[PDB]
Amino acid sequence: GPLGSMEDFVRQCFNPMIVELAEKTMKEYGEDLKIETNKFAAICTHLEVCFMYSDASKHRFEIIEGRDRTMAWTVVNSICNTTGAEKPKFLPDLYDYKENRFIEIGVTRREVHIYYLEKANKIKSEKTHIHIFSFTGEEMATKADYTLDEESRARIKTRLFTIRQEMASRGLWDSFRQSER
Numbered sequence: 001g002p003l004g005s006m007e008d009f010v011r012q013c014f015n016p017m018i019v020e021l022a023e024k025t026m027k028e029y030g031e032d033l034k035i036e037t038n039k040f041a042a043i044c045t046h047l048e049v050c051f052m053y054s055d056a057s058k059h060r061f062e063i064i065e066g067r068d069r070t071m072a073w074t075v076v077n078s079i080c081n082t083t084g085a086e087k088p089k090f091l092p093d094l095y096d097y098k099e100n101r102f103i104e105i106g107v108t109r110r111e112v113h114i115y116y117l118e119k120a121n122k123i124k125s126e127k128t129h130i131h132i133f134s135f136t137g138e139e140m141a142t143k144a145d146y147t148l149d150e151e152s153r154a155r156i157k158t159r160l161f162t163i164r165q166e167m168a169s170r171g172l173w174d175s176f177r178q179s180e181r
């Protein structure tokens with residue numbers, strides 16, 4: 001039927017804090033949200049997932065993603081100094097105080113195993129744990145260790161589904177999906 005605006009969708013669907021942080025991430029990349037709207041949506045989604053992952057167990061995780069790059073590195077360095085954790089080469093998304101490791105969060109509509117292998121190939125760090133979510137409910141994680149319980153992860157998955165369903169309902173899903181990578 002009607003074909004909506006992705007910008008409208010993002011602003012109606014995500015929390016304003018998430019939207020603004022997303023805008024900042026894009027601006028930090030010099031990129032224009034009004035042209036790269038699908039990517040804007042992707043950034044909001046990834047942010048929301050990182051935030052949900054953290055809220056699934058308050059104070060277990062330190063959030064790295066969403067901060068200014070400089071500030072993010074200061075947080076990472078302080079964590080490494082306090083815990084003795086090995087400094088990663090790339091900025092990760094979270095730190096798990098319980099399992100004593102950084103976490104990289106991926107969100108994709110590509111096939112999750114391939115996506116996982118790509119992330120793990122890029123990272124090169126034996127320590128950073130990778131957790132990949134797809135919009136279809138599949139997930140993939142380092143050493144089949146999924147960190148959180150089924151309830152929490154299902155909450156994340158459900159949110160992803162809701163996003164996909166509302167996109168599809170506005171006619172936005174095809175473009176969004178095809179726009180990855």
Ligand SMILES: Oc1ccc(/C=N/Nc2ccc(Cl)cc2)c(O)c1O
Binds near residue numbers: 046092093105106107
């Ligand atoms: O889920 C994630 C996927 C990618 C990134 C970081 N990407 N960084 C990056 C991506 C593209 C260029 Cl050209 C330069 C740097 C990242 O920080 C994530 O949390």
Ligand SMILES: Oc1ccc(/C=N/Nc2ccc(Cl)cc2)c(O)c1O
Binds near residue numbers: 039107
């Ligand atoms: O030009 C670009 C547009 C989008 C992306 C990232 N897209 N990520 C994404 C895109 C679609 C789905 Cl369904 C899930 C995740 C991106 O990395 C780009 O460089």
Ligand SMILES: [Mn+2]
Binds near residue numbers: 091092093
């Ligand atoms: Mn990140």
Ligand SMILES: [Mn+2]
Binds near residue numbers: 046093104105106
């Ligand atoms: Mn990530």
